[PDB]
Design an enzyme around this catalytic site. Structure first.
Site, PDB file in Angstrom:
ATOM      1  N   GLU A   1       2.618   6.403   6.277  1.00 50.34           N
ATOM      2  CA  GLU A   1       1.230   6.234   7.184  1.00 50.34           C
ATOM      3  C   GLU A   1       0.569   8.199   7.381  1.00 50.34           C
ATOM      4  O   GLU A   1      -0.854   7.941   6.553  1.00 50.34           O
ATOM      5  CB  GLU A   1       2.121   6.090   8.357  1.00 50.34           C
ATOM      6  CG  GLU A   1       1.535   4.796   8.892  1.00 50.34           C
ATOM      7  CD  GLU A   1       0.285   3.857   8.837  1.00 50.34           C
ATOM      8  OE1 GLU A   1       0.327   2.750   9.029  1.00 50.34           O
ATOM      9  OE2 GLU A   1      -1.082   4.382   8.779  1.00 50.34           O
TER      10      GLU A   1
ATOM     11  N   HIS B   1      -1.388   7.964   3.662  1.00 48.36           N
ATOM     12  CA  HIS B   1      -2.690   7.937   3.471  1.00 48.36           C
ATOM     13  C   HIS B   1      -3.634   8.815   4.489  1.00 48.36           C
ATOM     14  O   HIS B   1      -4.979   8.600   4.017  1.00 48.36           O
ATOM     15  CB  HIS B   1      -2.795   6.323   4.479  1.00 48.36           C
ATOM     16  CG  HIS B   1      -1.796   5.157   3.726  1.00 48.36           C
ATOM     17  ND1 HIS B   1      -1.530   3.861   4.112  1.00 48.36           N
ATOM     18  CD2 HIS B   1      -1.048   5.103   2.550  1.00 48.36           C
ATOM     19  CE1 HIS B   1      -0.600   3.515   3.529  1.00 48.36           C
ATOM     20  NE2 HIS B   1      -0.501   4.074   2.322  1.00 48.36           N
TER      21      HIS B   1
ATOM     22  N   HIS C   1      -0.918 -15.217   1.350  1.00 43.95           N
ATOM     23  CA  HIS C   1      -2.357 -14.166   0.431  1.00 43.95           C
ATOM     24  C   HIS C   1      -3.363 -14.784  -0.368  1.00 43.95           C
ATOM     25  O   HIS C   1      -3.893 -14.583  -1.527  1.00 43.95           O
ATOM     26  CB  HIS C   1      -1.444 -12.583  -0.140  1.00 43.95           C
ATOM     27  CG  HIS C   1      -1.226 -12.192  -0.039  1.00 43.95           C
ATOM     28  ND1 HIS C   1      -1.723 -11.109   0.907  1.00 43.95           N
ATOM     29  CD2 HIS C   1       0.342 -12.100   0.235  1.00 43.95           C
ATOM     30  CE1 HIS C   1      -0.274 -10.418   1.315  1.00 43.95           C
ATOM     31  NE2 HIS C   1       0.770 -11.076   1.124  1.00 43.95           N
TER      32      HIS C   1
END
Ligand SMILES: *[C@@H]1O[C@H](CO)[C@@H](O[C@@H]2O[C@H](CO)[C@@H](O)[C@H](O)[C@H]2NC(C)=O)[C@H](O)[C@H]1NC(C)=O
Ligand SMILES: *[C@@H]1O[C@H](CO)[C@@H](O[C@@H]2O[C@H](CO)[C@@H](O)[C@H](O)[C@H]2NC(C)=O)[C@H](O)[C@H]1NC(C)=O
Ligand SMILES: *[C@@H]1O[C@H](CO)[C@@H](O[C@@H]2O[C@H](CO)[C@@H](O)[C@H](O)[C@H]2NC(C)=O)[C@H](O)[C@H]1NC(C)=O
Ligand SMILES: *[C@@H]1O[C@H](CO)[C@@H](O[C@@H]2O[C@H](CO)[C@@H](O)[C@H](O)[C@H]2NC(C)=O)[C@H](O)[C@H]1NC(C)=O
Ligand SMILES: *[C@@H]1O[C@H](CO)[C@@H](O[C@@H]2O[C@H](CO)[C@@H](O)[C@H](O)[C@H]2NC(C)=O)[C@H](O)[C@H]1NC(C)=O
Ligand SMILES: *[C@@H]1O[C@H](CO)[C@@H](O)[C@H](O)[C@H]1NC(C)=O
Lengths: 146, 597
Positions: free
Chosen positions: B357, B360, B487
């Site tokens: 994380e 990002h 998805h």
């Protein structure tokens, strides 16, 4: 002369002789032969109020760049296109003033900084005010250089 | 007024306003996500509404500037991104119809309920228990039930809705000079007129079908191994020349074979590397793990954390009853106000997720200077790509024994390395055939090649041909199996999880060939190097301001995705699999059936 205002964090690099950018171009222009003294600090806890503090404006539209030490406070609606505006916002007729919305949860470079600048000039006067002198106890009964 | 002035002087104003508003919206949202109340939903919905209305008004206004009289590249790209109609080119009632069909599809997927034939009173949802039954059970009958049920009750309802959804989306896309909808998805990889860096919308299909050809030599051997191993838990249920039954893979749809590690471990008495008791025996909090992650990141030559991220972020779940969805996320509220929302526990898995994380977070810290409309990755794929290499480089035994979590005399051997490599390849190279198959199937059904009375037969023959798995029960054309995947029934693109798997290892090799490493790539680390940090940061800070095929060539040196780094990363596992299959039969014959015997 003493000027004071508030600006964004990463724009203090523009209060300096010979710079460019949306702030230094036409809000405040220092000349190329400056003799003053620039001081600038962080004032997050005093001027930033949660929810947005929309008091401080900063112009970002103007015909041509400013002149050193000049001042412009008008509120005439900009005109970028070719058709005259007649004072109505919309297509190619933009208001010239925006506002810094400060908040306490900003990173450095966006919290409000306070900037003050000093500028001296010696027209013709030969005595307007000298600096501060030293201090000490004047001895007596001794050959001294005074 | 140089016919472009309105382009630059408009853009500015837009920039400012945009950024500001967006921030208001986003703070609002982080709020509701960290403190679930009844009023916060209202405090955030109106902010999102104002943001959306402002953006759609600016989009309706930006049309008045033609797109061929622009000469500067960045302003043209910003306008081209903003000028997009998106939806709302349709007839107005059809727009509401499309919103209804989308929302009804999403709801029918979310609140699905399947109930036992022996007890129809109290029964099971999807998320709690169905995944557990399909992942942890071991009896053929219960798995076959849990598999056929979800496709017989959620596959049957979704077909008459998906039918209209396809045609509505096609009529939508066909008003923006596009010929179908799949092209409107592939349009993300498009680059026009930059004298050599161009990338036509079509060539994406060519690359994909050209890079899937080199994977099969490894996937075939992996399939052979997994099959000859599954032939032990269920004796005399699989054929040694056949495919696999869909309900034995490890989850509802067969997307990740990671849950097969319990049945196919190579050396079942040599435990892998695991720092879990050494952590708690050192009294590590949620602060220490993030401090370790930041130390690693600053070791390679990237900046610190913004010192506004240690007071605002929520690293540990709130003690009292404070409902906040515990799903890690890296927020970029803009204005340099970055945050990380995640409910960290003291486990090495959370220790790796923290790295993934903060990846990002760093990637968002880099490009914060670009205009607001260019604050993304180069495309949809680079984000998680540049994120994952940190987790891949922080889990090696070297970086572990250099932080104080492994005994100094811990000696690794080839057995543990093969174990780790198979645990990795069960997830990395396992999902690629499924991903490519599903995306190609969707592109086909969208372009109109597959008549709407041949959907399921085509889908199953594709599952037989490409990925090597066969249905356990026949299915006529009142079904729709793909509509049972999250998805798909939620209108989410599904090709990014195939380009990311390649970009990952390309970045890994391109980077730690600068750290002057010499051994196999699966031990390679990017710590203590400064050339690696510079090579990465000279791409992290571009954003969308340059075509992605330049963001690559400034890291690895090529102008497209290449699969060779992936195979070079797995070469040891491949050398082992070439020996462990001296006697089996590689490949599969698409004639065998689980019911035609
Ligand atoms: C989570 O949101 C709730 C809903 O507002 C907060 O509850 C009240 O918040 C106001 C805001 O200033 C306070 O004046 C009240 O005293 C709060 N009352 C109660 C019963 O909580 C709550 O404070 C929020 N949580 C946090 C950690 O800020
Ligand atoms: C138009 O394009 C030129 C280059 O083609 C841009 O020039 C760059 O501008 C940025 C800041 O806007 C500077 O930091 C760079 O140094 C400039 N490049 C060069 C080579 O001098 C220009 O910015 C573009 N116009 C706009 C409005 O962005
Ligand atoms: C976006 O949708 C509009 C319709 O709302 C398309 O039609 C253009 O609309 C603008 C202003 O609404 C007119 O100035 C143009 O003359 C219209 N026709 C054109 C541009 O051919 C518009 O085409 C759509 N955008 C694109 C890129 O096709
Ligand atoms: C791991 O390494 C050891 C030693 O390097 C390997 O042991 C030898 O493997 C070869 C391969 O055929 C055998 O011919 C030798 O007889 C083995 N040595 C002994 C002392 O028996 C071991 O094979 C390697 N692991 C794997 C899976 O190949
Ligand atoms: C590689 O990075 C590590 C991480 O800081 C450095 O580790 C230090 O190593 C020295 C000697 O090996 C120890 O005395 C320090 O205590 C270590 N620091 C920590 C925080 O553990 C290491 O120095 C780096 N490599 C080189 C060659 O400088
Ligand atoms: C990062 O933070 C540490 C605090 O431990 C400090 O010592 C170091 O100088 C900082 N580095 C940079 C580049 O800010």
């Amino acid at each position: 002369y003493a000027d004071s205002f508030v600006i964004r964090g990463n724009e203090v690099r523009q209060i300096a002789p010979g710079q460019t950018g949306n702030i230094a171009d036409y809000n405040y222009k220092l000349p190329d032969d400056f003799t003053g003294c620039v001081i600038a600090w962080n004032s997050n806890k005093l001027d930033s109020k949660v929810s947005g503090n929309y008091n401080y404006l900063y112009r970002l539209f103007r015909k041509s760049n400013l002149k050193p030490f000049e001042r412009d406070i008008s509120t005439e609606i900009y005109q970028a296109g070719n058709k005259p505006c007649n004072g109505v916002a919309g297509f190619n007729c933009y208001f010239p003033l925006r506002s810094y919305g400060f908040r306490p949860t900003y990173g450095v470079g966006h919290q409000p900084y306070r900037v003050v600048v000093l500028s001296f000039e010696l027209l013709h006067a030969p005595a307007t005010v000298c600096g501060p002198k030293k201090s000490t106890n004047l001895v007596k009964n001794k050959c001294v250089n005074f | 007024s140089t016919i472009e002035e309105q382009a630059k002087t408009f853009l500015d104003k837009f920039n400012h306003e945009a950024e500001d508003l967006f921030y208001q919206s986003s703070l609002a949202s982080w709020n509701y996500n960290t403190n679930i109340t009844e009023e916060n939903v209202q405090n955030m919905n109106n902010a999102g509404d104002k943001w959306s209305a402002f953006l759609k008004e600016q989009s309706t206004l930006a049309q008045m500037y033609p797109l061929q009289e622009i000469q500067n590249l960045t302003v043209k790209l910003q306008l081209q991104a903003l000028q997009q109609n998106g939806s709302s080119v349709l007839s107005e009632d059809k727009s509401k119809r499309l919103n209804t069909i989308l929302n009804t599809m999403s709801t029918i997927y979310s609140t699905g309920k399947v109930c036992n034939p022996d007890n129809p009173q109290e029964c099971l949802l999807l998320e709690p228990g169905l995944n557990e039954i399909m992942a942890n059970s071991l009896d053929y009958n219960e798995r076959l039930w849990a598999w056929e049920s979800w496709r017989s009750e959620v596959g049957k309802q979704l077909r008459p809705l998906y039918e209209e959804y396809v045609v509505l989306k096609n009529e939508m896309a066909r008003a923006n000079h596009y010929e179908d909808y799949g092209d409107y998805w592939r349009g993300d990889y498009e680059v026009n007129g930059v004298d050599g860096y161009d990338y036509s919308r079509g060539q994406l299909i060519e690359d994909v079908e050209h890079t899937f050809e080199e994977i099969k030599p490894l996937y075939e051997h992996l399939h052979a191994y997994v099959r000859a191993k599954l032939m032990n838990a269920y004796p005399s249920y699989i054929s040694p020349i056949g495919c696999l039954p869909a309900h034995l893979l490890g989850d509802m749809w067969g997307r990740f074979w990671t849950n097969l590690y319990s049945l196919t471990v190579p050396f079942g008495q040599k435990p892998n590397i695991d720092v879990t008791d050494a952590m708690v025996d050192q009294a590590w909090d949620a602060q220490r793990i993030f401090k370790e992650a930041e130390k690693f990141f600053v070791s390679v030559g990237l900046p610190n954390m913004t010192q506004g991220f240690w007071e605002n972020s929520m690293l540990t779940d709130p003690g009292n009853v404070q409902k906040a969805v515990c799903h890690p996320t890296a927020w970029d509220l803009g204005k340099g106000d970055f945050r990380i929302l995640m409910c960290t526990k003291v486990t090495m898995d959370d220790f790796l997720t923290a790295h993934h994380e903060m990846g990002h977070i760093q990637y968002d810290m880099a490009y914060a200077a670009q205009p607001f409309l260019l604050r993304n990755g180069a495309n949809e794929g680079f984000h998680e790509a540049v994120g994952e290499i940190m987790s891949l480089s922080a889990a090696t035994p070297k970086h572990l024994k250099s932080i104080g979590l492994l005994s100094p005399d811990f000696q690794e051997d080839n057995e543990t390395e093969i174990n780790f490599l198979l645990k990795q390849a069960l997830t990395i190279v396992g999902t690629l055939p499924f991903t490519y198959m599903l995306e190609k199937w969707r592109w086909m059904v969208f372009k109109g090649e597959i008549p709407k009375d041949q959907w399921m037969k085509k889908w199953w023959e594709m599952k037989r041909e490409i990925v090597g798995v066969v249905e356990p029960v026949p299915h006529d054309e009142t079904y729709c199996d793909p509509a049972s995947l999250f998805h798909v029934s939620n209108d989410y693109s599904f090709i990014r999880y195939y380009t990311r798997t390649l970009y990952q290892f390309q970045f890994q090799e391109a980077l730690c060939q600068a750290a002057k490493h010499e051994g196999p790539l699966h031990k390679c680390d990017i710590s203590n190097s400064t050339e690696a940090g510079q090579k990465l940061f000279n791409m992290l800070r571009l954003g969308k301001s340059e075509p992605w095929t330049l963001a690559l060539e400034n890291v690895v040196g090529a102008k497209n995705m290449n699969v060779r780094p992936l195979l070079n990363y797995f070469e040891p596992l491949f050398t082992w699999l070439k020996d462990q299959n001296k006697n089996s039969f590689v490949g599969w014959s698409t004639d065998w059936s689980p019911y035609a015997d």
